[PDB]
């Protein structure tokens, strides 16, 4: 019967759980027709991690493994195959009951970052190193992290080494152009295009009419081109971390929370925090929620599903 709590954190002290970014705004989009079923930042209110969700902020959209060889590919640039391990270096077992190695990206797009290597062999017995900008196309048929390997491309033409430990540090997107297939709500095919994704965290949606999902939104950097892409998560990484630590039993399917302004002690609006780990609000518009960034959600009480939220 441990009481349920959220951390006391300003919006500026929250991290996106789907890409390593600060949270920039709360956000609604009630006319979204896509199915919302992201796999990172998934955690039940009683602390069960789901999908590909792991606890490290540095693990979100990261890969660890080994380049096996250069490969041939139509598209621009140079291409490389790498095996991927678990984030802590232990081999990934594709029969593990997860959709893919924990931290694997959960959306279609060209993910821009840096590939770096530190050789295992040995110069003062000091290993050789290199790092280069890289792009991982998660929509591609060669993106098969559930099978233990992925592809990435570089602008660099040859300075990537086979058989050496490899790390991908995510930075942003390469492009949001038409042929870059950015869609934050389309899952990758974790095993390749003709195979079913498995062990997925469930989709989320409002049920009571008049309600919509409330997202923690971050704007994601672009390597070049035009656009203002954003990534919406259901709960910031710090809530994932806190809920996991607390392991508090959920006393209903819906926790009523209030967004409070500590400068005034007042509630700005209320929201439903649902057992599976997401928020709904009674809002009839899209766009940012304009609220003091010093404010924060506070747990009020457990309510039933038929509770009527005061409109925002």
């Amino acid at each position: 019967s441990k009481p349920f709590t959220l951390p006391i954190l300003t919006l500026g002290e929250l991290t996106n759980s789907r890409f390593p970014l600060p949270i920039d705004v709360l956000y609604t989009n009630p006319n979204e027709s896509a199915i919302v079923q992201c796999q990172n930042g998934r955690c039940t209110l009683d602390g069960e991690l789901q999908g590909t969700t792991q606890l490290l902020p540095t693990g979100i959209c990261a890969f660890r493994g080994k380049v096996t060889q250069q490969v041939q590919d139509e598209h621009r640039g140079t291409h490389w195959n790498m095996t991927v391990t678990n984030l802590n270096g232990t081999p990934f077992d594709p029969t593990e009951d997860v959709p893919a190695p924990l931290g694997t990206p959960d959306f279609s797009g060209q993910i821009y970052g840096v590939i770096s290597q530190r050789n295992t062999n040995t110069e003062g017995n000091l290993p050789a190193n290199r790092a280069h900008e890289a792009v991982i196309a998660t929509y591609s048929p060669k993106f098969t992290p559930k099978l233990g390997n992925i592809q990435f491309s570089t602008w660099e033409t040859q300075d990537v080494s086979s058989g050496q430990p490899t790390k991908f540090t995510p930075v942003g997107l390469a492009s949001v152009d038409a042929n870059s297939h950015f869609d934050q709500w389309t899952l990758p095919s974790y095993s390749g295009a003709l195979t079913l994704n498995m062990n997925l965290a469930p989709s989320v949606a409002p049920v009571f009419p008049g309600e919509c999902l409330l997202f923690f939104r971050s704007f994601i950097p672009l390597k070049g081109g035009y656009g203002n892409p954003a990534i919406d998560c259901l709960m910031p990484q710090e809530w994932v971390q806190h809920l996991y630590q607390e392991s508090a039993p959920s006393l209903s399917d819906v926790a009523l929370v209030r967004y409070v302004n500590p400068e005034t002690g007042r509630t700005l609006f209320e929201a439903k925090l649902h057992r599976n780990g997401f928020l709904t609000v009674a809002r009839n518009s899209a766009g940012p929620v304009v609220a003091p960034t010093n404010g924060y959600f506070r747990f009020d009480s457990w309510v039933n599903q038929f509770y009527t939220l005061a409109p925002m």
Partner: nanobody
Amino acid sequence: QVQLQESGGGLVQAGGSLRLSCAASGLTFSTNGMGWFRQAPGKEREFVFGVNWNGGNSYVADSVKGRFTISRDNAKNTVYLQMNSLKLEDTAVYYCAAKMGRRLAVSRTLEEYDFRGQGTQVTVSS
């Protein structure tokens, strides 16, 4: 399609050791919590040793603390109860239980688990 199968039990003298095995099918131990209970005739069941999905949190019964340990072989989807020094109090049927999900908490009551095996018998004699 979840099955849990225990083995490794036997007859042993006080001060001896066994290694129990719990193999699973339809479920990977690396993504769920599990626990060992024991059931001797004429005695209420007792929680022995439990662990969460990544092994980062456990519960060990005070009576067995310095004597029982656990290990896992993820490749074999099997976890082990190592009983390094057995006492006469330990005689019982030791069985395996799984609770679905990747969480921190380690449940100590059987009704909170989702699956159990039949067990394997352990007798400490002389």
